[PDB]
Design brief:
heterodimer, A: Rossmann fold, six-stranded mixed β-sheet, three-stranded antiparallel β-sheet, 5 helices, B: 0% helix, enzyme activator activity (chain A), phospholipase A2 activator activity (chain A), death receptor binding (chain A), cyclin-dependent protein serine/threonine kinase inhibitor activity (chain A), peptidase activity (chain A)
């Protein structure tokens, strides 16, 4: 039915918080991202994850961190969580100096490549753009090596993802709120569905630029999990 | 509101 979550440790929560980018890249500063990083740290600490925050990592440091983490002994840990806060494009998240393929990052944790996490949920939470589209909205015994991954993307494929410079990103704000409210009673997919509704219904952009004004967002869950996940 |  459900994943075993009563190992002595819930597991690691790796938070990569990229705010400032090398001038040569031409990428903008991500105001509000520190609000996300603090919110996530508290939220996951409260769920008994061992949280590690890293700020402003190059593309090389990102890859090296994830490799190092995949090489740890996770035998006593129930699960693994990685949160990525950066610029992105479809399939890609940005280090401070350039892009990294998301598949490169997640592949370190494949069932054949990280044995101490085989059969355990590996959760990737991604706040980053997936392209440049804008949503105008509408008035209303072996196991597969790719098994047991969940990718929780902030936005639909092809689309921008929205971040408030004061309040933090729409997705991370909502994710943390729903985890706080529901982690003690809902299964993870149902929590994420509540996140989808919150983002989709409660948020709409405001801009003096007509092209960017009155826009909407829907997060996108990719589940390759084989069991239900309860945090309690 | 800003985009990533």
């Amino acid at each position: 039915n459900s994943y075993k979550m009563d190992y002595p440790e819930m597991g690691l929560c790796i938070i990569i918080n990229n705010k400032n980018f090398h001038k040569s890249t031409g990428m903008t500063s991500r105001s509000g991202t520190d609000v996300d990083a603090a919110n996530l740290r508290e939220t996951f600490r409260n769920l008994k994850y061992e949280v590690r925050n890293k700020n402003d990592l190059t593309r090389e440091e990102i890859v090296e961190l994830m490799r190092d983490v995949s090489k740890e002994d996770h035998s006593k840990r129930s699960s693994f969580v990685c949160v990525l806060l950066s610029h992105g494009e479809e399939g890609i998240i940005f280090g401070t100096n350039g892009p990294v393929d998301l598949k490169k990052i997640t592949n370190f944790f494949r069932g054949d490549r990280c044995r101490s996490l085989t059969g355990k949920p590996k959760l990737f939470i991604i706040q980053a753009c997936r392209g440049t589209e804008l949503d105008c909205g509408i008035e209303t015994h072996k196991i597969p090596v790719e098994a047991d991954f969940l990718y929780a993307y902030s936005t639909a494929p092809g689309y921008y993802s929205w971040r408030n410079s004061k309040d933090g990103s729409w997705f991370i704000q909502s994710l943390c709120a729903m985890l706080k409210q529901y982690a003690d009673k809902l299964e993870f997919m149902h929590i994420l569905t509540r996140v989808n509704r919150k983002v989709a219904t409660e948020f709409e952009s405001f801009s003096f630029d007509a092209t960017f004004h009155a826009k909407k967002q829907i997060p996108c869950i990719h589940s390759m999990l084989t069991k239900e996940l309860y945090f309690y | 509101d800003e985009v990533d």
